[PDB]
Each structure stands twice: as C-alpha cells, then as structure tokens.
Amino acid sequence: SERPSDLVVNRLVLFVVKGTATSTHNTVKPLILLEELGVPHDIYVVEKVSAPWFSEINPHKMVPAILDRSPDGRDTLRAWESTSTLMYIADAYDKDGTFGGRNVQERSEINNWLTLHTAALGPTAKYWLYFYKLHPEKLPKTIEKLRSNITVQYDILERRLNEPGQQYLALKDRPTIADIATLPFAMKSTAELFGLEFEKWPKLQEWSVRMGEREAVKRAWQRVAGFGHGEKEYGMLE
C-alpha cells in the first residue's frame, strides 16, 4: 500500500507498538542502545503490524523495525528483527565499538552470547507467550516444556556469570549488545511472568540489577511503556 502521510526519514526512525507489559520486550533493545550512544532518532507507533505499508519495511511484520538514511544521506536502508536492529545501530553509530566490540576477540564472545539469545531464549520465550495466551487452544504440555527450556537458558547464563571476573555476559569489563538483547528476557518481572523464582539464579539476578541501574536502560524502559499512550496514539511522535 502507501506510506502514511506522517512517515518521513530525516533520521533513524524506530517502529514500535502501543506500550504494554508484553509489547516492549523486543522494541526496548534498540531503544536502550540508541539511549546509550545518544543517537538522534524518531519513534513511529504502528497501529497494525499487519498493514501492507509496514511489510515493505519488515517482511516479518513485527516491531522493532528501523528506517534510516544511508551514511552519505542519498539512500534509505532498513533493519528488522531486534538482534539485527542492535547490529545495525552498532555498525552505523558505535564506530569505536564500545557496545559492538573493538576487535575480533571481543566480537567473537559478543556474537556468541548475542546469538545464544537470538536462537535459544529469544524464540523459546516468544513460543512460550504465544502458546500461553495467543494460540486459540491451550496446550499445557507444550507450555510446560517451553518453561523448562527457559530454565536451561537461565542455567547457561548463571554458569557464565559465575566465572571469575565475568561481570557481563560477553566481556568482563563492560556491557555489550549481547547484554542488551538478553536483559528483557532475563529480569525478575519477566521471570515472574514465566512463573519462575528469579532468586534461583543469583549471579543472573545481580547482573540484571546492574544492567537496570544504567541511566540509558532506565530511560528506555520509561519511554517504551509510554509510547502510544501520549497525545498521539498512533503514527510519528513529536
């Protein structure tokens, strides 16, 4: 179809939906990294991700998605899938690799822990929530297995954060796009949604609190809850 009247690309545009307890856990990831790097950006609140105009931006028809100007400003490019939005923002805006990785060694571990989330906890959590409340019929045995698979992912993260000096998932010294991608599915509130006691993974809990105390993370959680509840319900925010 046609782009809405109010959709223009003068800078990075992050596509989101109306903030709810379960609508923000993927969209908050690129928003954390934008807040961390202080990247100039707009927010577009999509009413319907099923709308044909949106599929042209993200053929998977989900948020988050990004439209941005190419480095020279002549062309517009796109990023979609939360992990891909983190990789794009790091590529375009994190030139000294503070969150992307400064060398092959740092990027090897960042990509390991980022991909572990993208392949395992991320999709498992998405399937858990889908079967738990979106699938027309309730399938408790499938829901229970997916819940059990989440505990195995928590076990792997817990083991990593028990290693000497390992303050963050990828690097010892600082948080990376691996930590940002993992945080929304490895914090107390999300653990409680899954029906899990988060205190059973103490180093992972400590890690999640340490991440949550970062000012950029606080600002991202604030803003993502508010999107679509302000003066403008849908479209390009002021």
Ligand X SMILES: N[C@@H](CCC(=O)N[C@@H](CS[C@@]1(Cc2ccccc2)NC(=O)[C@](S)(CO)NC1=O)C(=O)NCC(=O)O)C(=O)O
Residue 49: how many CA atoms within 13 Å on its side-chain side? Answer: 14
Of the candidate residues 44, 54, 80, 207, the single one contacting a second copy (CB under 8 A): 80
Is 81 an interacting residue with respect to a second copy (CB under 8 A)?
yes
Determine the 3-state secondary structure of 67 from DSSP: strand
Residues 115-154 that bind a second copy (CB under 8 A): 115-116, 118-120, 122-124, 127, 131, 135, 137, 139, 141-142, 145
d(CA 177, CA 113) in angstroms, rounded, equals: 9
Is 63 an interacting residue with respect to ligand X (CB under 6 A)?
yes
Buried b (16+ CB within 10 A) or exposed e, 194-219: bebebeebebbbebbeebeebebbee
Is 159 an interacting residue with respect to a second copy (CB under 8 A)?
yes
Is 162 an interacting residue with respect to a second copy (CB under 8 A)?
no
Nearest to 227 by CA among 47, 38, 4, 2: 47
Is 79 an interacting residue with respect to a second copy (CB under 8 A)?
yes
Nearest to 14 by CA among 84, 111, 75, 73: 84
CB of 226 to a second copy, least distance (A): 27
Nearer to ligand X, 147 or 219 (CB): 147
- 58 sits in the region (left: phi over 0; alpha: psi -120 to 50; else beta) called beta
Taking CB within 5 to 8 Å according to partner kind, which of a second copy, ligand X, none is near residue 49? ligand X
Binding-site residues: 26, 63, 82, 126
Residues 72-91 that bind ligand X (CB under 6 A): 81-82
What does the DSSP 8-state code read for residue 121?
I
d(CA 108, CA 115) in angstroms, rounded, equals: 11
List residues near a second copy by CB under 8 A: 59-60, 70-71, 75, 77-81, 83-84, 87-88, 91-92, 103-105, 107-109, 111-112, 114-116, 118-120, 122-124, 127, 131, 135, 137, 139, 141-142, 145, 156, 159-160
